[PDB]
Amino acid sequence: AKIKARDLRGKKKEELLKQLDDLKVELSQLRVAKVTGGAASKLSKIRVVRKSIARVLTVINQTQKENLRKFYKGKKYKPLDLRPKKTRAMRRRLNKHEESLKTKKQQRKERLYPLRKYAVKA
Amino acid sequence: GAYKYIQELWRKKQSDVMRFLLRVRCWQYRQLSALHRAPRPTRPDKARRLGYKAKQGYVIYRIRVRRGGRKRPVPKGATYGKPVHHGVNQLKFARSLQSVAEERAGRHCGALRVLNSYWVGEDSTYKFFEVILIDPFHKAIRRNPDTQWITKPVHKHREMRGLTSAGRKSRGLGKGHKFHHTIGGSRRAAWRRRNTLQLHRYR
Amino acid sequence: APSRNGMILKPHFHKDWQRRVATWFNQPARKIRRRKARQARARRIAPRPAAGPIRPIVRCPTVRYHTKVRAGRGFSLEELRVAGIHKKVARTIGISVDPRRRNKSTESLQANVQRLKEYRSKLVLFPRKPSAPKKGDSSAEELKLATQLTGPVMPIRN
Amino acid sequence: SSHKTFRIKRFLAKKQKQNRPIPQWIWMKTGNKIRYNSKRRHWRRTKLGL
Amino acid sequence: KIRTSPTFRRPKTLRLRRQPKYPRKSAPRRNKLDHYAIIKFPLTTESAMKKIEDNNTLVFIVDVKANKHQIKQAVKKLYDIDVAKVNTLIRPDGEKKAYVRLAPDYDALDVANKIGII
Amino acid sequence: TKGTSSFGKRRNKTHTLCRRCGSKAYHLQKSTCGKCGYPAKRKRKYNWSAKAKRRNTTGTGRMRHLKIVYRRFRHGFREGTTPKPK
RNA sequence: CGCGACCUCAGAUCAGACGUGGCGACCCGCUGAAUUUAAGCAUAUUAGUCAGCGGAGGAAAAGAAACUAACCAGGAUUCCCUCAGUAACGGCGAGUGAACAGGGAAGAGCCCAGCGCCGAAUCCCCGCCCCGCGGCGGGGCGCGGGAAAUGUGGCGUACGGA
Ligand SMILES: [Mg+2]
Ligand SMILES: [Mg+2]
Ligand SMILES: [Mg+2]
Ligand SMILES: [Mg+2]
Ligand SMILES: [Mg+2]
Ligand SMILES: [Mg+2]
Ligand SMILES: [Mg+2]
Ligand SMILES: [Mg+2]
Ligand SMILES: [Mg+2]
Ligand SMILES: [Mg+2]
Ligand SMILES: [Mg+2]
Ligand SMILES: [Mg+2]
Ligand SMILES: [Mg+2]
Ligand SMILES: [Mg+2]
Ligand SMILES: [Mg+2]
Ligand SMILES: [Mg+2]
Ligand SMILES: [Mg+2]
Ligand SMILES: [Mg+2]
Ligand SMILES: [Mg+2]
Ligand SMILES: [Mg+2]
Ligand SMILES: [Mg+2]
Ligand SMILES: [Mg+2]
Ligand SMILES: [Mg+2]
Ligand SMILES: [Mg+2]
Ligand SMILES: [Mg+2]
Ligand SMILES: [Mg+2]
Ligand SMILES: [Mg+2]
Ligand SMILES: [Zn+2]
């Protein structure tokens, strides 16, 4: 059957491993058939088996890593793979609150003397 | 306050007390390594004038610079050219030894950032400098808005570009008639602004 | 090898000048860029003048130019003290202030104080909150009639 | 050299697989510009560097 | 306390083990050298079939990163057969040819007819 | 006998394939690379070798990370967000 | 001799972070020639130039006078026109060569140490609860641990300040 990625997400992890092992046996048999000399149906089927293995392993990796970041979401310290991977100079910046931290004297200046809204006449 | 008394006490260096102190400190710092950490400043008043505060993430390194002028790194004589450039011994390095101290401390610590530095002692063969280094990454500096400009990536390695005071004294920059050769950005910007043809459209 | 008759000349092309040739083909694009930045500032400050704060009646130094009158850096502290405007209020209400200037002459002092008195009358100060006006604010008929002034505000004429 | 290393043997192994010519279906495509393999290295003519 | 030796070595200070608050990576990397991925294909060479029919072996093509113990446990787990020994060579193509000598209780021709090669 | 007869004695090798630049310029006696300077932490490049610059720049090889850096830059480096599903 | 502090100096696969290297057109700091010209050449010139070295950023640097001027005085820095191929330097030879001011683009000002007043009034980390958690932040509860009087925070900096 056409192994789609939609129904692989709702299933249990052991069913994903059993389907993965069945696809690995299917890939090994198609490689044996290719080396002995097989049908062009099998020669086109081996690509479908490889892409199905890629889909099953992708769904397994999704259900692993989203559950891991759901586990490490509430904690303050999280692993480096779960930390947001953006550029290094953007990670080494200041914080959003630390860019808003002003001094007491500067806040006193902003309270006492705000930039007034004004206009002039002709 | 006590700091003014300590200030003119460090000023009056030719007295017996301060000559004894400079001799003992210079001896001890010569027996110490060429680059190490002072956990507290030798001149706390001068460190406070330069910008050191007593909080976490402000580090002070005591390093030494070997004293003397810069000779030309060539084999024996052998500066191949006109007799102007055969000078090798009596050449002098363009920056000061305090700025050499700053750039050596900043090259040993790429994470730490040089604020400034000060003199503590000198021998005939060595000078001795305390370089103030700052974490741009510790929370006591990072959450403080007065010093968070140190946490910005623009001030990476001020000691090499000459943005600290000992480097700025070597650049020859300033205002007025005595500083015409560095008008603009720097001496290089002055030379480049002066040596261009402004070949316009309509001329 | 010079010929029969002509000016003596010193061409300053003995350096490698062809590396540093500033071509000026950026010029109309930079005129468009200055124009767009100036219109962007004018749209940013909507009631305020597009030029900026007012600049003093200023005598020139250096005896070639002292008959001419310029627009200076800012008003003096003694000028602000005579006119009765605090130096931190002045920067907020749109007045150029510099502490470096002195006041040797009395006539230019009185002229800049009079220019402050004229600008305080010509100024239309909008309230901080529109629902609750304050004591030192303009009237509601002036709130609608206030608009920008194109060019330099109070242009200094010699 | 009969006394080979793994890195040098792998480097020779890639060149031995690169030494093969083109197939016959590759010049039946639409935008073909390849008549033959121009990178055919012979073991007497080009000595592979080194 | 008396100084026995005239040298002063560095004293044996106490050091602690790694007790990290959070692991470096979120998940351990899965074994990508599976038993299915470590065995690519058996050869259908006339010489390989002569080797199978005569010397009671099986000729496989294996990834180059493998071990003889890995090939032995891979054949034992996949095809459910015991292995006498494994002889490995690396071809000038690049892949690892493996002569898997089996135990004489099972037949190489029977397991070759089981897996499909002839 | 400095030519044809002397060329026959050339069998031992001095350079070999380097493992950082890939070119056969790794001297065995000095244990350093003559192309890029492998025991040095920095890449050996020079401004007199202007043509040898552009043989090895960022535009030469794969850029297997830098092209997706550019692709994430052109949409402002969004992380974790997903598009609206069907 | 034993115990307990302080000061200096070690060892950690200790808990949490950072730096290394690349590109390098523009920018900063060094180092730095010889071709060439002077119809030779040695000072000069090419030239603070090529090459070499280190360091960043989207701009860098500079930057709010230990300024310019001597006038009825101007007033941070940067860039353009002009000053001006001028003053000046130069086997006063070849050649080199600014600055002030004026017209504009832009225009934004400030913070510490010291001096002093306030029961260290200050900062970091770890435990619990609530919000939010893909730029780990805000509040409360801890006879919790440290930093700091060899000085953290507020007022306050040459325009005066308390
Ligand atoms: Mg304060
Ligand atoms: Mg000369
Ligand atoms: Mg120099
Ligand atoms: Mg600066
Ligand atoms: Mg000086
Ligand atoms: Mg003629
Ligand atoms: Mg003529
Ligand atoms: Mg304007
Ligand atoms: Mg031959
Ligand atoms: Mg050799
Ligand atoms: Mg380099
Ligand atoms: Mg650790
Ligand atoms: Mg670097
Ligand atoms: Mg000549
Ligand atoms: Mg000639
Ligand atoms: Mg000659
Ligand atoms: Mg010169
Ligand atoms: Mg260069
Ligand atoms: Mg960058
Ligand atoms: Mg800057
Ligand atoms: Mg000026
Ligand atoms: Mg003229
Ligand atoms: Mg003469
Ligand atoms: Mg010159
Ligand atoms: Mg001017
Ligand atoms: Mg204080
Ligand atoms: Mg000042
Ligand atoms: Zn190499």
From Swiss-Prot, chain A:
Q: Which GO terms describe its molecular function?
A: mRNA binding; structural constituent of ribosome
Report if keyword Transmembrane helix is assigned: no
- Family, per entry: Belongs to the universal ribosomal protein uL29 family.
Indicate where the modification N6-acetyllysine is found in the sequence. Answer: 18, 42
- Give one Pfam hit by family name: Ribosomal_L29
- Give the matching NCBIfam families: L29
Covalent link Glycyl lysine isopeptide (Lys-Gly) (interchain with G-Cter in SUMO2), residues:
24
Q: Which organism is it from?
A: Oryctolagus cuniculus (Rabbit)
Tell me the compartments it is located in: Cytoplasm
Q: Which residues carry this modification: Phosphoserine?
A: 28
What are the boundaries of the region Disordered? 84-122
State its role. Component of the large ribosomal subunit. The ribosome is a large ribonucleoprotein complex responsible for the synthesis of proteins in the cell.
The record, for SUPFAM superfamilies, names:
Ribosomal protein L29 (L29p)
Q: Which UniProt keywords apply?
A: Acetylation, Cytoplasm, Isopeptide bond, Phosphoprotein, Ribonucleoprotein, Ribosomal protein, Ubl conjugation
One GO cellular component term of this record is: cytosolic large ribosomal subunit
Its name, as the record gives it, is Large ribosomal subunit protein uL29
Q: Which is a GO BP term held by this UniProt record?
A: maturation of LSU-rRNA from tricistronic rRNA transcript (SSU-rRNA, 5.8S rRNA, LSU-rRNA)
Task: Indicate the principal place this protein occupies in or around the cell.
Answer: cytoplasm
UniProtKB/Swiss-Prot annotation, chain B:
Q: Enumerate the UniProt keywords alphabetically.
A: Cytoplasm, Isopeptide bond, Lipoprotein, Myristate, Phosphoprotein, Ribonucleoprotein, Ribosomal protein, Ubl conjugation
What SMART domains does UniProt report for this protein, alphabetically?
Ribosomal_L15e (SM01384)
Q: Some GO term, biological process aspect, for this entry: which one?
A: cytoplasmic translation
One Pfam family name is Ribosomal_L15e
Q: Which InterPro entries match?
A: Rbsml_eL15_core_dom_sf, Ribosomal_eL15, Ribosomal_eL15_CS, Ribosomal_uL23/eL15/eS24_sf
Q: Where is the composition biased (Basic residues)?
A: 168-181
Q: Which GO terms describe its cellular component?
A: cytosolic large ribosomal subunit
Task: Tell me which domain of life the UniProt entry assigns to the organism this sequence originates from.
Answer: Eukaryota
Chief place where the protein resides: cytoplasm
Instruction: Return the Gene3D superfamilies for the record.
Output: Ribosomal protein l15e (3.40.1120.10)
Stretch list, region Disordered: 164-185
Q: Where is this cross-link: Glycyl lysine isopeptide (Lys-Gly) (interchain with G-Cter in SUMO2)?
A: 82
Keyword Nuclease appears in the UniProt entry: no
Report the locations given in the UniProt record.
Cytoplasm
An annotated Gene Ontology molecular function? RNA binding
Modified positions (Phosphoserine) are 33, 96, 99
Question: Lipidation (N-myristoyl glycine) at which residues?
Answer: 1
Q: Main role?
A: Component of the large ribosomal subunit. The ribosome is a large ribonucleoprotein complex responsible for the synthesis of proteins in the cell.
Subunit organization: Component of the large ribosomal subunit. Interacts with IFIT1 (via TPR repeats 1-4).
What protein family is recorded? Belongs to the eukaryotic ribosomal protein eL15 family.
Q: What is this protein called?
A: Large ribosomal subunit protein eL15
Origin organism lineage: Eukaryota, Metazoa, Chordata, Craniata, Vertebrata
Curated annotation (Swiss-Prot), chain E:
| UniProt feature, compositional bias: Basic residues | 1-29
Q: Which residues carry this modification: Citrulline?
A: 3
Where does it live in the cell?
A: Cytoplasm; Nucleus
Highest rank taxon of the organism = Eukaryota
What are the Phosphoserine sites (modified residues) in this protein? 5
Q: Which UniProt keywords apply?
A: Acetylation, Citrullination, Cytoplasm, Isopeptide bond, Methylation, Nucleus, Phosphoprotein, Ribonucleoprotein, Ribosomal protein, RNA-binding, rRNA-binding, Ubl conjugation
- Which cellular component terms (GO) are annotated to the entry? cytosolic ribosome; nucleus; ribosomal subunit
Output the GO biological process annotations, alphabetical, semicolon-separated: translation
* Modification type N6-acetyllysine: residues: 32
Q: Which GO terms describe its molecular function?
A: rRNA binding; structural constituent of ribosome
Stretch list, region Beta-like import receptor binding (BIB) domain:
1-36
Post-translational modification, briefly?
N-terminus is methylated by METTL11A/NTM1. Citrullinated by PADI4.
Entry-annotated residues carrying Phosphothreonine:
7
- Family from the record: Belongs to the universal ribosomal protein uL23 family.
* Its job: Component of the large ribosomal subunit. The ribosome is a large ribonucleoprotein complex responsible for the synthesis of proteins in the cell. Binds a specific region on the 26S rRNA. May promote p53/TP53 degradation possibly through the stimulation of MDM2-mediated TP53 polyubiquitination.
Q: What's the record's remark on domains?
A: The N-terminal beta-like import receptor binding (BIB) domain mediates interaction with IPO5, IPO7, KPNB1 and TNPO1.
Quaternary organization = Component of the large ribosomal subunit. Interacts with LYAR and GNL2. Interacts with MDM2; this interaction may promote MDM2-mediated p53/TP53 polyubiquitination. Directly interacts (via BIB domain) with IPO5, IPO7, KPNB1 and TNPO1; these interactions are involved in RPL23A nuclear import for the assembly of ribosomal subunits. Interacts with IPO8.
UniProt name for this protein: Large ribosomal subunit protein uL23
Q: Which gene encodes it?
A: RPL23A
Swiss-Prot record, chain F:
Query: Membrane-spanning residues where?
Result: none
Where does it localize? Answer: Cytoplasm
Stated role: Component of the large ribosomal subunit. The ribosome is a large ribonucleoprotein complex responsible for the synthesis of proteins in the cell.
Tell me, in one coarse class, where this protein mainly resides: cytoplasm
| Keyword Metal-binding among record annotations | yes
User: Record's family?
Assistant: Belongs to the eukaryotic ribosomal protein eL37 family.
Q: Where is the signal peptide?
A: none
User: What Pfam families does this protein map onto?
Assistant: Ribosomal_L37e
InterPro entries per the UniProt record, alphabetical: Ribosomal_eL37, Ribosomal_eL37/eL43, Ribosomal_eL37_CS, Ribosomal_zn-bd
Q: Name one GO molecular function term.
A: MDM2/MDM4 family protein binding
Q: Which residues bind Zn(2+)?
A: 18, 21, 33, 36
Does the record bear RNA-binding in its keywords? yes
Which Gene3D superfamilies does UniProt cross-reference here? 2.20.25.30
- Residues recorded with modification N6-acetyllysine: 9
Its subunit composition reads: Component of the large ribosomal subunit.
Q: Record the organism.
A: Oryctolagus cuniculus
Zn-finger region bounds: C4-type? 18-36
Q: Which domain of life is it from?
A: Eukaryota
GO CC, sorted alphabetically, is: cytosolic large ribosomal subunit; synapse
What is the protein's given name? Large ribosomal subunit protein eL37
Question: Which key words are in the record?
Answer: Acetylation, Cytoplasm, Metal-binding, Phosphoprotein, Ribonucleoprotein, Ribosomal protein, RNA-binding, rRNA-binding, Zinc, Zinc-finger
Q: Which gene encodes it?
A: RPL37
Give GO BP annotations, semicolon-separated: positive regulation of signal transduction by p53 class mediator; translation
Q: What is the lineage of its organism?
A: Eukaryota, Metazoa, Chordata, Craniata, Vertebrata
